[PDB]
C-alpha cells in the first residue's frame, strides 16, 4: 500500500525549474525508509519536522514538486531566501514546513552537445507569489513593441538555456531537487503507517 514516491524520484525525466513538475499524493502508507536514507542523496533538510518524527508523522495530503536547478543555486530554495531562481522562477512560502532534497546530477542529465533543452526564467516583471506557476511565452521589452516587430532593443525572451556540459565545474553541475509539502488543514488524515 506504499506511495509511488520511489518512481517520483527515480523516474529520471525531470522537466525544468521553469513550470516545475508536481504530484498530489493521497491515500497510502508513506514508508520513508528510503527517503533521505538512500545513498547518493546530496542534501536533504526539513523545517518544522524531524525526519524520524516525520516517519511517524502523518498528514491530510501531500504535494511533491520536482525540478532541476544549477548547483550553486540550491541554497536559494529556502523560506523567503532571495536571489534569482527564488524571486522570479519558483518561490516557497515563509512558514513552509517540510523538506527539500538535492542530488548532484553531474552525469545523469548532461550531454557534450549541451543538455540545455530546458530554458530557465531570467526576465520577470514582478516578484512571485508562493507556488505561482508562471510558464509563459512573451517578449520582455523596454520600448513600445516586443521583438515580434523590433530587434536588438526591447527584444528579450525570458527563457534562457542552461548549457550543461561536462567541462563545467561543480558550481555548474545540474542538481536535481525535489520538495515535499505536507498540508494539515481539515485533515481526515489518510496517510501514515
Amino acid at each position, epitope marked *: 500500500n506504499l506511495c509511488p514516491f520511489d518512481e517520483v524520484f527515480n523516474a529520471t525525466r525531470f522537466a525544468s525549474v521553469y513550470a516545475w513538475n508536481r504530484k498530489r499524493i493521497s491515500n497510502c502508507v508513506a514508508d520513508y525508509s528510503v527517503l533521505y536514507n538512500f545513498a547518493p542523496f546530496f542534501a536533504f533538510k526539513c523545517y518544522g519536522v524531524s525526519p524520524t518524527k516525520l516517519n511517524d508523522l502523518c498528514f491530510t495530503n501531500v504535494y511533491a514538486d520536482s525540478f532541476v536547478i544549477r548547483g*550553486n543555486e540550491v541554497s536559494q530554495i529556502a523560506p523567503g531566501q*532571495t*536571489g*534569482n531562481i527564488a*524571486d*522570479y522562477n519558483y518561490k516557497l512560502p515563509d512558514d513552509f514546513t517540510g523538506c527539500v532534497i538535492a542530488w548532484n546530477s553531474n552525469k545523469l542529465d548532461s550531454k557534450v552537445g549541451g543538455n540545455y533543452n530546458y530554458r530557465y526564467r*531570467l*526576465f*520577470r*516583471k*514582478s*516578484n512571485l507569489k508562493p507556488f505561482e506557476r508562471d510558464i509563459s511565452t512573451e517578449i*520582455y521589452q*523596454a*520600448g513600445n513593441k516586443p521583438c515580434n516587430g523590433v530587434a*536588438g*532593443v526591447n527584444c*528579450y*525572451f525570458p527563457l*534562457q538555456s542552461y*548549457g550543461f*556540459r561536462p*567541462t*563545467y*565545474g561543480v*558550481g*555548474h553541475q545540474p542538481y536535481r531537487v525535489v520538495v515535499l509539502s505536507f498540508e494539515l488543514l481539515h485533515a481526515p488524515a489518510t496517510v501514515c503507517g
Partner: antibody
Framework: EVQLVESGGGLVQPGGSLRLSCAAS????????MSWVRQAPGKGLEWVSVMFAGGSTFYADSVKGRFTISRDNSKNTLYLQMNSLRAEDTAVYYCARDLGVVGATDYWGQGTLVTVSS | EIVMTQSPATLSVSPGERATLSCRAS??????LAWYQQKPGQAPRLLIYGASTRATGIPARFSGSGSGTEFTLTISSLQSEDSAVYYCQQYNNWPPGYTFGQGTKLEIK
C-alpha cells in the same frame, strides 16, 4: 538619446553621508537590472551594488551594511545612499544596465567623482 | 571570487599590424565573458560579449576567442585611435556578481 546621466558627485568629510543619483532616457530602469560600479584613481573596477526588477537588492561585501540602493520609478531614476565614507571610498562611480548572457553590460553613465576631505 | 589576470601589462605595436591580448581566469568561466575598451576620459565601451560575439556596431576588426580559463582578443589593423585601456569582465554568477581584470594599456609606435 539612450543615456544615463549622474549627479551627487563631490567632496565630503569622512564619516559623512552622500547620495548619488542617476537619470535615464529612451530606456526604463524600474524593469532593468541596474548596477553601480566604481573605480579608484589608477586601479581597475569593482562591482559596488545592484538592484533587480522586483526590488530585492544586493551589495558587495566591502560595502555591505553601509550603502543602500533605491530608485524613484515614478520618474524613471535610480539612487544610491552612502554613509560613513572612509578613506577608501574615494572613487568615480558609474551607473549601468546589465543583461548578462543575453548582452553583457552595455549602457553606462558619464560617471561621478567622489572624494573626501583628505 | 574568481581572480582574473590580464597579459601583457603594456603593448606598443607599429600601426597596421595585428594585436593579441590574453586574459586568464582561475576557475571554469566556460564562455561567459566580455571585453570593454575604456578610451581615456569617459566610461568604458563594450566590444565583445559572451565568448566572442561581437557587440552591435563594433567594427569587425576585433575578434574574440578562447574558452574555459583562457581567452584572447585580437585586433586586425590598429588605427591611430585604438590606443586605450582594455578590461576582460567575467560573469559566471550573474545575479549579483562580476569580477574585473587589471586592465591593459595599448598604444601605437
Amino acid at each position: 538619446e539612450v543615456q544615463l546621466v549622474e549627479s551627487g558627485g563631490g567632496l565630503v568629510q569622512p564619516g559623512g553621508s552622500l547620495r548619488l543619483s542617476c537619470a535615464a532616457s529612451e530606456i526604463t530602469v524600474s524593469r532593468n537590472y541596474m548596477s553601480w560600479v566604481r573605480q579608484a584613481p589608477g586601479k581597475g573596477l569593482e562591482w559596488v551594488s545592484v538592484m533587480f526588477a522586483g526590488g530585492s537588492t544586493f551589495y558587495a561585501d566591502s560595502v555591505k551594511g553601509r550603502f543602500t540602493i533605491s530608485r524613484d520609478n515614478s520618474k524613471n531614476t535610480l539612487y544610491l545612499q552612502m554613509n560613513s565614507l572612509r578613506a577608501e571610498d574615494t572613487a568615480v562611480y558609474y551607473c549601468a544596465r546589465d543583461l548578462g548572457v543575453v548582452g553583457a553590460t552595455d549602457y553606462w553613465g558619464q560617471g561621478t567623482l567622489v572624494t573626501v576631505s583628505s | 571570487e574568481i581572480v582574473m589576470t590580464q597579459s601583457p601589462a603594456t603593448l606598443s605595436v607599429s600601426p597596421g599590424e595585428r594585436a593579441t591580448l590574453s586574459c586568464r581566469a582561475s576557475q571554469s568561466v566556460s564562455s561567459d565573458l566580455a571585453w570593454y575598451q575604456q578610451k581615456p576620459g569617459q566610461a568604458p565601451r563594450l566590444l565583445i560579449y559572451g565568448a566572442s560575439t561581437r557587440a552591435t556596431g563594433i567594427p569587425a576588426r576585433f575578434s574574440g576567442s578562447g574558452s574555459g580559463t583562457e581567452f584572447t582578443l585580437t585586433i586586425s589593423s590598429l588605427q591611430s585611435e585604438d590606443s586605450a585601456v582594455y578590461y576582460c569582465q567575467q560573469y559566471n554568477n550573474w545575479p549579483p556578481g562580476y569580477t574585473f581584470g587589471q586592465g591593459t594599456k595599448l598604444e601605437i609606435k
